[model samples]
Target chain A: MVIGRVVNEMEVGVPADDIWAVYSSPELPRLFVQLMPNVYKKIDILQGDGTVGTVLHIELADGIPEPRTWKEKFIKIDHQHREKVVRQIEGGFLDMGFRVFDVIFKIIEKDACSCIIRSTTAFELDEKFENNANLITAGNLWGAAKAISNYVIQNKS
Target chain B: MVIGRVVNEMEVGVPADDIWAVYSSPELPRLFVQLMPNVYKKIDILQGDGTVGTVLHIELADGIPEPRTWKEKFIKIDHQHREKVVRQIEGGFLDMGFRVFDVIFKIIEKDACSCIIRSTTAFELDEKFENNANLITAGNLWGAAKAISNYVIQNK
Candidate 1:
């Protein structure tokens, strides 16, 4: 197996707390689906109180002609540092032959009225696809950051 | 068919606004299912945007081994009065041969830090089961109120 990671950052013109408010809200996932109906269908809370150990069942919006589903579990929530970690437990990467996958989001306070949001994704893929896996994983991370940032901007918590 | 109603109330230590925040959140149904796995399996937002006319598909938690599902629609929302109304559009009562069923919740303020929550359920049922139906419906309403209030308290 081959392992890889991707880290991306973007600056937003909102307070770190404002970004965190939108990120931590239980409506974030649904808000994403509502905003990007073409990329996401619905998000189901399988087990959770919007905290660590929460399990989410995410149905993807169609890529071809049919939709896909992914299961994720929240592993860490560091309120003090404004960061959270989500581990992909089933579907998605696993279906794509990946063995391990995790996504992390860290909100860094840049100033009183602005902040920098960083996203990091790590994955282990089959050796045969080592060269191509990084591109795919990077794209996924980039897409997520874009979608989430757009949501926060439009909703403006 | 016979029409009947059930009115129930309970007091909570939290203010009316606090309770309303949880009640009116778009995540309310999901929160209910998460907090009460024994009573709800899942809640699907079918239509509308968490306002009046919004439709919800609710899957019941198992009690007798087999789960049930219901379709409910929001009929009223009065934030000024801290009230909301949900009517059973399909499943449950309809399956039981009822013609109408609606549940209303009103959060009455008592003071700055406490409040009274009330639930009223109105339903129509067959004459043969009128007496038993009211008892059952009343019990269900009481159970839901207790569970939700307890959830709010614990999470707060």
Candidate 2:
């Protein structure tokens, strides 16, 4: 059964390499887009080579608003692929069965200064979940890519 | 349908407070019995409250790593209920499909020196994955936990 859907795909004007730099940088996830408003702050970063089991800490504003948070681990990282750059780890909602959701960021260099940043994802949802937040999720990605892309364009010399 | 399954549950020998000390410390995730050796080498304690969005750096025998290191953000850190403490953020497998797996460490301090560390987790699989291996998948969570536990017990 199709437990999840592809959602929406939006393109932006930005450089893939620049976006890649932002995406790869652990310090920039919160800056990517404000998915949870003030919540979703990056906490931890893995050591050495940065392969297979790097953990990150994030606090959600939903539960207690101020104190509660979650630490997610980026168990795997792939820098070899041009079409796709993936970080597979655990967090957000694992124990409750939301196991994996490939947050695929597709970057295409539209021009020297303008590139297309596309985010395509598939969630690991239960039968009860009907992809209700696809638009919101996709918009978050698109908006994040745009925000980061704008930052890169403004900063990159 | 089942969202996730209780893969494994063990009794932490350390007390809830002590275990929480290790968990809330952010620098002491290495003290837990689940972090795989392939990823982190040595954990360094960070100074401060170690609250939500608290960041840390993972070290190796070679030296400090690059870009950004591991992070510790509190999800629901509380002592009275012995509830949710530490959560991961930065270096996770966001590309993979296993999006949500917060390490629910409960400090069961029976006494001053003895306590049980319980790691409760939540995870999801990719909708259309073709045998992908990015982060520590759920299928392998047990083995990973056991390995870390063994190291903790053996070393301490």
Q: Who wins the lDDT comparison?
A: 1
TM-score of each: 0.46, 0.39
Q: What is the C-alpha local distance difference test score of candidate 1? A: 0.70
Candidate 1 lDDT over B14-125, as tens digits, reads 9898888777767778877787777788889999899889999988877723227889998988899999899999886667655777888889999999987777666666
Enumerate the chain B TM-scores of all models. Answer: 0.86, 0.54
RMSD of each: 23.5, 19.6
**TM-score of chain A considered alone, across all candidate predictions:** 0.84, 0.64
User: lDDT tens digits, residues A1-157, model 1?
Assistant: 4444444456778888888776766677777777777777889999988889999998877673321778999898888998988898988677766787788888899999988777666666664544334233222344455567777778754
Q: Give candidate 2's TM-score.
A: 0.39
Off by over 4 Å in 2: A7-10, A29-39, A46-52, A62-71, A75-80, A83-91, A128-136, B1-156
DockQ-based CAPRI category assigned to the predicted complex of candidate 2: incorrect
TM of chain B vs. native, candidate 1: 0.86
lDDT of 1 at B119: 70
Q: Which 10-residue window in model 2 chain B sums to the lowest lDDT?
A: B130-139
Model 2 interface root-mean-square deviation: 14.7
Candidate 1 ranges beyond 4 A from true positions: A1-157, B64-67, B128-135
